[PDB]
Design a protein around this ligand. Structure first.
Ligand SMILES: NC(=O)c1ccc[n+]([C@@H]2O[C@H](COP(=O)([O-])OP(=O)(O)OC[C@H]3O[C@@H](n4cnc5c(N)ncnc54)[C@H](O)[C@@H]3O)[C@@H](O)[C@H]2O)c1
Ligand SMILES: NC(=O)c1ccc[n+]([C@@H]2O[C@H](COP(=O)([O-])OP(=O)(O)OC[C@H]3O[C@@H](n4cnc5c(N)ncnc54)[C@H](O)[C@@H]3O)[C@@H](O)[C@H]2O)c1
Ligand SMILES: O=c1ccn([C@@H]2O[C@H](COP(=O)(O)OP(=O)(O)O)[C@@H](O)[C@H]2O)c(=O)[nH]1
Ligand SMILES: O=c1ccn([C@@H]2O[C@H](COP(=O)(O)OP(=O)(O)O)[C@@H](O)[C@H]2O)c(=O)[nH]1
Ligand SMILES: O=c1ccn([C@@H]2O[C@H](COP(=O)(O)OP(=O)(O)O)[C@@H](O)[C@H]2O)c(=O)[nH]1
Ligand SMILES: O=c1ccn([C@@H]2O[C@H](COP(=O)(O)OP(=O)(O)O)[C@@H](O)[C@H]2O)c(=O)[nH]1
Lengths: 312, 312
């Protein structure tokens, strides 16, 4: 059994990771500032002898004793990371430096929640871990894209110079229960529009592509990577790729909705395609996703139908 | 007349910029930690009523009153920026945040000394300001390359969110008097090897290319950009491109040396070509370089011949 810190642990992915590690008998500390997450996502563990929740911003120094750190603290939705670009940049840079400083002092292993956005608007397909990416350093999404790229650089600098044990996950689009209704990402927007009979809002023509993974698959991958001997980056995603118009049509069908599909302005600097190569995770970890897309989407639709009731 | 701060002002470029602004009658403050620069580069101004030198690391907070900030603090030579990757990353991230915080508080205009390295190992030619670059986020040079890319992102975040007036220069390879003998960049290495009859050490085959600019041209460009109304990035460089083997042959000829040219291992992740497009600087600033390559190299050779005497 281990002492484990999860930054961003009151968010969407972090709350599901908290559940797995608590069930396995570890001592878990969650750090969050509730910028985009909420106490409600982890409230079922409050009071348990092996759990603590701390209201703390990772840009401020933190001194505790742990064996492992899962570093997930950052806004993740484009409308929420572009809300305040200075906050986004400070979280990814100063926040990551503070957590590597902690790992160095106490001898902890640190895992970074990086992103497929490090690949930018890709010029190879699929995207494997050897691709360097195509990213605008001064566009409206750069506060996030460049913040995450430099966070990876920081991890490898501390490994080489100070002997810190590091792990890096490049996470592809993941969805599931506990996402906020006003999060603004595509799966939550389309499900809620369809449920209410409002127009599904496609940004641009809808020919751009993404590949979506259910949250339980991501959580199993994160724990496998943390406890492996692999320090170089590993893609964690589902290789099944579709267009955004196809995704709108599928959601409309699974919900059983009469919503119109409408076409609005394109998003500025929007990546036009995305598909992970997961050969490395398969061969080095023995990991692959096991939840089919329709099964996962049905679990998410159930969550949001309940939420609209928790409102009405 | 203005109150002006120059971070990195005791280094190679910064010391020449200090000279220009002092001659023009401004009040100049230099901040430096002497990691790669030295007091000797600005010692001629010490005691002047309009000059102050402060021993200060930009990662530590700084509270002074100025009208303009030229932000040049970072190691610049690949052997010196790869010496300690953690120091390089902290300087470019935390240092830039502290200087933007200062500009916000006092209402100063800030100029960033960015780099052609933001373009990486390029896949277009020449390189104009609209190119996004091809950069390895986790290779041995990334501590510098990614540090500089995210520093640009930070400047535009403060302009948009807080109304800070910003200027961004993308600087291409620049050489001249005052470079350290053990700096490790190619112009200083080749000149000193040739002067001493030692082998000129070409890294790889020598087919890789660069375009070199004399320091006085860079300084005139930096002042023109600072005092313009152009906030988007501007390339400052000399468009004359040659191979590294051609440069070795030219230096050997200008020095009059019998040195052998030897071929050693390639540098890891070394950019294979580089040539600036300077149409934007020409049309928006009325600026172009005016010092020919041979004239500039002869000025640099004179400096190093004197230095080897200051040793012997
Ligand atoms: N879900 C995905 O498809 C996806 C894709 C790529 C990367 N990621 C990464 O995984 C992580 C989790 O993403 P998510 O989808 O759960 O989003 P989320 O917004 O639900 O979770 C992020 C959490 O971090 C917290 N946080 C933000 N800034 C903080 C700060 N300065 N100090 C302390 N806490 C802070 C938020 O309050 C929130 O609880 C993020 O780092 C994200 O960039 C997720
Ligand atoms: N000369 C070039 O070809 C070139 C090319 C691209 C970019 N640049 C940029 O221009 C700037 C000047 O480069 P240079 O060639 O004069 O190199 P340099 O090494 O001579 O100058 C850098 C100066 O910054 C100082 N410094 C470093 N870290 C510091 C810190 N944390 N706090 C305070 N001072 C610190 C050094 O001591 C030095 O005096 C750098 O930012 C460099 O990245 C130069
Ligand atoms: O237990 C710790 C140790 C350090 N830090 C922060 O991590 C940063 C980076 O640590 P590092 O060891 O690199 O810095 P140093 O001690 O040399 O200043 C420091 O500035 C601290 O603010 C932290 O938050 N918790
Ligand atoms: O209401 C929406 C929300 C998003 N998108 C598009 O769906 C894709 C995925 O967007 P998301 O914000 O979920 O993720 P990311 O862009 O970070 O991959 C992008 O092409 C968006 O422009 C859309 O068409 N309508
Ligand atoms: O005159 C100043 C003002 C601020 N700072 C530093 O700049 C950083 C960023 O400033 P900002 O205004 O963004 O931060 P805030 O005041 O909101 O913390 C601060 O944390 C300070 O340490 C500085 O060095 N000199
Ligand atoms: O002794 C040396 C020093 C550098 N170079 C090469 O010259 C080019 C320019 O190197 P420098 O360090 O001056 O600048 P940068 O790589 O930052 O442009 C690169 O291809 C280097 O590998 C070389 O052949 N011999």
């Amino acid at each position: 059994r281990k002492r484990i810190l999860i930054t961003g642990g009151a968010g969407f992915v972090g709350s599901h990771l908290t559940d797995k590690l608590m069930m396995d008998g570890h001592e878990v500390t969650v750090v969050d500032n509730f910028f985009t997450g909420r106490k409600r996502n982890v409230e079922h563990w409050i009071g348990h002898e092996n759990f603590e929740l701390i209201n703390h911003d990772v840009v401020e120094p933190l001194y505790i004793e742990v064996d492992q750190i899962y570093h997930l603290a950052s806004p993740a939705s484009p409308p929420n990371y572009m809300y305040n670009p200075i906050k986004t940049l400070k979280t990814n840079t100063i926040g990551t430096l503070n957590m590597l400083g902690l790992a160095k002092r106490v001898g902890a292993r640190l895992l970074l929640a990086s992103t497929s956005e490090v690949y930018g608007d890709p010029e190879v397909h699929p995207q494997s871990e050897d691709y360097w990416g195509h990213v605008n350093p001064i566009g409206p999404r750069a506060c996030y894209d460049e913040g995450k790229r430099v966070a990876e650089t920081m991890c490898y600098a501390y490994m080489k110079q100070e002997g810190v044990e590091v792990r890096v996950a490049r996470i592809f689009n993941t969805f599931g229960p506990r996402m906020h209704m006003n999060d603004g990402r595509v799966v939550s927007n389309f499900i809620l529009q369809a449920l209410q009979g409002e127009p599904l809002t496609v940004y641009g023509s809808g020919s751009q592509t993404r590949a979506f993974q259910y949250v339980s698959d991501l959580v199993n991958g994160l724990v496998a990577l943390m406890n492996s001997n692999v320090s170089s980056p590993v893609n964690l995603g589902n290789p099944e790729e579709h267009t955004i118009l196809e995704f709108a049509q599928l959601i409309k069908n699974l919900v059983g909705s009469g919503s119109e599909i409408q076409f609005l302005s394109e998003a500025q600097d929007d990546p036009q395609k995305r598909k992970p190569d997961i050969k490395k995770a398969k061969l080095m970890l023995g990991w692959e996703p096991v939840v089919p897309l329709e099964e996962g989407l049905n679990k998410a639709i159930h969550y949001f139908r309940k939420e609209l009731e928790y409102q009405a």
